């Protein structure tokens, strides 16, 4: 409510208090001005953050070890085009039925916040989350680190969304660098570390 803003001296939009984690008053196009949309965009930002972080660590760490020798994992940009134990199109069907189910229940939870906290096969199992986007329970917060004081939950979720935002620019950078340069990300960083003033986005 008196927090640092993405634009010091500017005035934050009325729909952004500071009660949301990662609230820095940035929405110059009013994409979240309607409260119904702002709640949907929070959930969309949360899942974009969590997929980007898994994706970032899934392309930066494995490529970081193959550039050496600890791993031999192929280029992240081409790992999809190679063949596996079954064909790629069977893996995609198994992915949809498995991810669609998990996505379906998350969807139901967004539109009806308490309806899917109970295990449909063994109704003894239950999730523990109170807020949409933080399902809790044993399967997603087995340590109990998700249930804390609202002061710590504000920071912990701000750490969550900040790491997810950075990961989003990073993953999108890894996709763009691989097309403008011609190698992997670990190569780009060393090249820029070999000569910082010249080995950049300029080649001409």
């Amino acid at each position: 409510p008196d927090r640092p803003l993405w634009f010091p001296g500017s005035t934050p939009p009325p729909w952004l208090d500071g009660s949301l984690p990662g609230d820095f008053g940035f929405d110059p196009l009013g994409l979240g001005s309607d409260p119904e949309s702002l709640r949907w965009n929070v959930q969309a930002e949360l899942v974009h953050s969590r997929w980007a972080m898994l994706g970032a660590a899934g392309i930066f760490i494995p490529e970081f070890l193959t550039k050496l020798g600890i791993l031999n994992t192929p280029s992240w940009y081409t790992a999809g085009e190679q063949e596996y134990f079954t064909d790629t199109t069977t893996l995609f069907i198994v992915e949809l039925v498995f991810i669609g189910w998990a996505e379906g229940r998350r969807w139901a939870d967004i539109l009806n916040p308490g309806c899917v906290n109970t295990d449909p096969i063994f109704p003894n199992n239950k999730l523990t989350g109170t807020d949409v986007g933080y399902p809790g329970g044993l399967w997603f917060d087995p340590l109990g680190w998700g249930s804390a004081s609202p002061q710590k939950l504000k920071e912990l979720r701000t750490k969550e969304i900040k790491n997810g935002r950075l990961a989003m620019l990073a993953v999108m950078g890894a996709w763009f660098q691989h097309i403008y340069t011609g190698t992997g990300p670990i190569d780009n960083l060393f090249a820029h570390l070999a000569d910082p003033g010249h080995a950049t986005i300029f080649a001409a």
Binding site: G30, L31, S33, D34
Partner: protein, 39 residues
Amino acid sequence: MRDLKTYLSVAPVASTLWFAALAGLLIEINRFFPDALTF
């Protein structure tokens, strides 16, 4: 934003978006299954 969403719903705007989507659909059906005279 709600004013903008109202404008985006006005007859001409909703028509181009509807017919654009329609044209794309019919074009791609014709790229995938061209020269269909029967059925």
